[PDB]
Symmetry: C3
């Protein structure tokens, strides 16, 4: 899968240009420090919009070779140490979505939990589990 990603700020384009360690998942960044209040879910804004592209496949069903596809949003295994849990389990981002990617993070503790810019709680994966590439693009 290849992803085209729009950064919603220069700050965010700079952490994506310098993505160090990059797999069948693409780690997304927490982009702004933030406090997640206890026993409640926060819709964390990852400062990014993104289409996913994939080779057209033939499938059973009662215009191009390379198709706009749906993709998934997984919790990173990391999240386990944390009291944050994905409130929708796995994110499913339909092919036609053009909003910002959000991580719906459920804070299970009775305390505040603090996330920080450059934190890594979440990752994008393809329905194939195939390796992911991305380019930075302005629209």
């Amino acid at each position: 899968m290849h992803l085209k990603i729009v950064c919603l700020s220069d700050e965010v384009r700079e952490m994506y240009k310098n993505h160090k360690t990059h797999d069948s998942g693409l780690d997304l960044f927490i982009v702004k420090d933030e406090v997640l209040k206890p026993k409640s879910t926060t819709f964390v804004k990852l400062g990014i919009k993104a289409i996913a592209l994939q080779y057209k496949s033939n499938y059973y069903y009662k215009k191009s070779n390379i198709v706009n596809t749906s993709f998934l949003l997984f919790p990173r295994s990391s999240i386990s140490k944390t009291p944050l849990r994905l409130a929708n389990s796995i994110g499913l981002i339909d092919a036609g979505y053009r909003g910002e990617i959000i991580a719906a993070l459920d804070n299970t503790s009775d305390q505040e939990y603090h996330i920080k810019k450059n934190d890594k709680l979440v990752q994008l994966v393809s329905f194939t589990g195939e390796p992911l590439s991305f380019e930075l693009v302005e629209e």
Copy 2:
């Protein structure tokens, strides 16, 4: 992928014939009757349908295929969670489809007929089709 689906009552068949939110890599299933979900419990909610999934044979390393039951993105606005994260429905299954919902709040939670908490999706993430049908080949 193509779903053949048996609706287990005329109310439910109504909902699916006039299904006004399926255009899609997922297929929204409806809550079929009002329920109060006890707090901090898990409840097995019956969805009023049997469903078989069909895909072109691949070579691994038309056939019956395994498929998935995802939470809908919008369940995140509630205290409800799929106990089993993502439902895995084997190819051989012909029973009623059921969602295991955890109510994670200290208070009861009400769900209503025509609520859409859950969706069917193919392992490929491809667009889905479905017909309604009076029964499955089971004999």
Copy 3:
């Protein structure tokens, strides 16, 4: 998909030669708890499944911007839901280059202890295609 499991003990190698609940159709390969444990109420325990493993499939073309190894998935079993145990990271994603022990992060959501027994089955391995799975016991 095909799996090559190295069991990390002999007691565990036992479990897998005599695997009862896998047969030839399905899409999930059940994994055994491998030793008794108690999980402290309201907590997330890493539970070690006492195996390591690589998956292989017929390679295809993919967009970028024979037999290959591949990423695969650790799902909860349907049956986990009659428990207060939940998979913390929802679905484990295991990358083509993992060569360590399969571990299962389980939250206990109980305000009590929960004893997990050897030969319990809370968790299963699945392929991205949902296709049936073979396994093979291996030492390397």
